[PDB]
Design a protein around this ligand. Structure first.
Ligand SMILES: CC(C)C(=O)N1CCC(c2ccc(NC(=O)n3cc4ccncc4c3)cc2)CC1
Ligand SMILES: CC(C)C(=O)N1CCC(c2ccc(NC(=O)n3cc4ccncc4c3)cc2)CC1
Lengths: 464, 465
């Protein structure tokens, strides 16, 4: 990895565009204007890409040769990069202050600030915008996953007496549906801020390396079938496949995809009749989890529950909701996103089925179908010092007041009512709102403050 | 990187689930029935993750330790992985056949197939499904980028009579808007299959390392401002900022973001009056490229062109469309996706503005706002050998006929009319169609066939002339 080649091309030309004699460029990140966001992922970026010796003579030469061909011109700041290499042993003279990871903050607040610590490196602040703005992704995955946790908690509380098993109710199925191996690890780790169930193995190693947990692993899974393991037996042998799989995993929970040919026949005739003796004999710690994977998600879930309810002994909870026996559960892992999850739990509640009967698997909906526009994650310059005079800088486009940015030196505070406020124009210097909530997390090539994954999870907890 | 830890967790348990006495598991990838897709990205995956010694005693031990805690159980095929390590020096006994990269294939056709070459490794075919299915991303980016090139080509030909500059008309602005550094490189490389303009520097190194070009670089850019380089001068000094920047880059094209405070004032009064003398003196090879970045994308483009048309000399080309002077152009780099791109070029055509006046910059629309669902990229088992007997396997869910998968051994052929057909149930073995278009690209840990990036670009070319 070469940080000199890890920016938007036009940033290579910016050192020539700032006002002459600029000694300081100060910038910030916010989720402009999903009312609250989970701040997560900056520590990964700081450790993997920004800390230590990130500049070498070879990296400078490599960048110089690439940019000369890419621009068909010599515009690369070889002198500027050589200065960092010689003066600081290739360590970045930058200071980053950030809100603690896992913190849940309302939209429109400063989340982190960046500034150069050497006047010669005024151009460095925004060079690293590209790599830091990629924080949008773990922030957005963690926020969207926590918003789904709120729906699940609300319905699980209403339909049962409690929140038992909430941490396992939304399982990450997103490994194949993301854009890369690196994205799979980042996104799966962001989902693990809120839940404990994942099939995206890449998330485990990232948490272990960059954050750390008291427990050996941050996420868990159970044995499960896929269409190839059912269909490989042949169309007329679906029962044989099911019998083999549940006998192989007789003492652990086992998820079995049941829609290869006819989900309704599989539930009523195969599970409900032919193999019923192998299911009713299972332990409460080893249920069969039936997996539909096609059709209208709500209609399919309700019909599967009706079928199972007529074949297996159903009880009524203390809240008056129907409950399958403890050796039998369902997982809906097709077409699940925050909208369909809400439609399904509401549809189940209206048909008097407890949410303890169901779990959800989400792939693309959880990890891929997200963009930087969802939370309006943005990085902007708010303060510069030119000719030794500090000026409050901002954009304010005529046609879009939503794109207006903050002015001057920023700080995050607690209001008298305990809410959050971002003070602009260095107003935090007046001791009216107490102490700034942002902490220095990076300074001059070193990570100065870090958080464990257990601390992040505690910070990200729901009030409920 | 550890391939034993690079699969969906449940795949760790599948070796115990397949029918006993299974010696072959054969699977395929298709973009299930954007009528045609660009096949691109498999070569990256083969080289980075699948080739050579991918199994070591240390990787087996690390996997075993993680899975014991992840499952709270000892389900992990240690014998199976040790076998590959001992018999094959950790090289995968898999054969992958694929259509050549850059090939444009209608939907619902086999694009690649995977099978184990050793009977003991029947479980390995689908172990690597997760890693191979990630090819959905470069295929989708390249396809969606090509569909935008079709729109631009149609409108550029209609309003100007030629395709000059088409390859620089859609610039990649997506580096910050993607989910990771790895995604940035893959996605940027996929867009470069169709165009030559990028700011996502990451794509250059990926192409150089995994594909290669005769030219020193596959993508190009020009100097451009950002809001920080304009706003840093202060609100009352936007004209000074503009003046400094166009003077610094007087001999090359320069893009200047002009909406920091009031895009319309910047166009009419700053560029159009105060600094007009610095614009009209510029070379045809060094235009000023005005960049709006807010407001309704179509209304803004149209209003910017109407302002510039009243401040600068406008000509009428041979097609009857208005053309700004050659030293002045516009780039719309906000809210651009395939739908808004079509809306802007149609809107411009209705107002009699040539498409030679505009370029587009696309970020999230080009590289992030895409999912595996767009082309229904899917990997499924179609053939198995159990007790020495080959059986055609498939799924066919009652509630969704669109999720039905293909049966048996597959092959891809040219039809007599020059279209494509996927033959199922090993029917390709009859010599009724020409040669199978799928070629072996990987076998037993070796990449057996590679394509250069120049070959991929040629294969992905549009028909237009
Ligand atoms: C009370 C209990 C039964 C409960 O609610 N639990 C919550 C749910 C939990 C669970 C259920 C299923 C799966 N895996 C699958 O169904 N797979 C993994 C996949 C990955 C990718 N594509 C498809 C997949 C199918 C894992 C954990 C068991 C405990
Ligand atoms: C006829 C000529 C003028 C033409 O059509 N060309 C096609 C367009 C080409 C070009 C125009 C602009 C930019 N870059 C920018 O505007 N930047 C890069 C960014 C990256 C991320 N975010 C915001 C950005 C703003 C690069 C190349 C010049 C030649």
């Amino acid at each position: 990895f070469n940080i000199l080649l890890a920016t938007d091309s036009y940033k290579v030309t910016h050192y020539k565009q700032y006002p002459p004699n600029t000694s300081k460029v100060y910038s910030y990140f916010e989720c402009r204007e999903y009312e609250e966001t989970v701040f997560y992922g900056l520590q990964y970026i700081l450790n993997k890409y920004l800390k230590g010796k990130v500049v070498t003579k070879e990296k400078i030469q490599e960048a110089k040769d690439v940019y000369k061909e890419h621009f068909q011109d010599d515009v690369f700041n070889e002198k500027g990069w050589n200065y960092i290499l010689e003066k600081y042993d290739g360590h970045l003279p930058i200071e980053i202050k950030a809100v603690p990871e896992g913190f849940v903050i309302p939209r429109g607040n400063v989340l982190f600030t960046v500034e150069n610590t050497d006047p010669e490196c005024y151009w460095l602040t925004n060079w690293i915008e590209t790599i830091l703005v990629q924080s949008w992704y773990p922030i957005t995955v963690a926020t969207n996953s926590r918003e789904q946790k709120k729906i699940l908690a609300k319905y699980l509380l209403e339909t049962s007496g409690n929140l038992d098993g909430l941490e396992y109710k939304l399982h990450d199925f997103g490994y194949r549906g993301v854009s890369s191996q690196e994205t799979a690890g980042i996104g799966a780790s962001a989902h693990l801020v809120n839940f404990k169930g994942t099939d995206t193995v890449a998330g485990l190693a990232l948490i272990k390396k960059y954050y750390g947990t008291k427990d050996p692993v941050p996420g868990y899974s159970v044995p499960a079938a896929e269409h190839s393991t059912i269909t490989a037996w042949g169309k007329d042998h679906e029962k044989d496949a099911f019998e083999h799989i549940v006998t192989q995993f007789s003492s652990v929970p086992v998820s079995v995809v049941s829609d290869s040919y006819d989900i309704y026949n599989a539930c009523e005739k195969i599970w409900g009749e032919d193999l019923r003796h192998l299911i009713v004999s299972r332990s409460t710690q080893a249920p069969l989890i039936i997996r539909p994977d096609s059709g209208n998600p709500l209609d399919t879930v309700l019909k599967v529950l009706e079928i199972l309810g007529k074949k297996f002994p159903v009880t009524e909870n203390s809240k008056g909701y129907k409950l399958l026996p403890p050796y039998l559960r369902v997982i809906q892992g097709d077409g699940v996103d925050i909208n369909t999850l809400q439609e399904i739990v509401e549809g189940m509640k209206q048909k008097m089925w407890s949410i303890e009967n169901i779990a959800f698997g989400s792939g693309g909906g959880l990890l891929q179908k997200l963009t930087r526009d969802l939370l309006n994650c943005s990085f902007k310059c708010s303060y510069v010092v030119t000719n030794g005079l500090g000026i409050n800088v901002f954009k304010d486009p005529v046609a879009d007041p939503n794109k207006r940015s903050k002015k001057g030196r920023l700080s995050l505070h607690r209001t008298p009512a305990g809410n959050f406020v971002t003070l602009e124009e260095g107003k935090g210097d007046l001791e009216e709102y107490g102490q700034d909530l942002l902490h220095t997390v990076f300074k001059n090539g070193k990570v100065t403050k870090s958080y464990s994954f257990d601390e992040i999870r505690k910070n990200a907890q729901l009030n409920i």
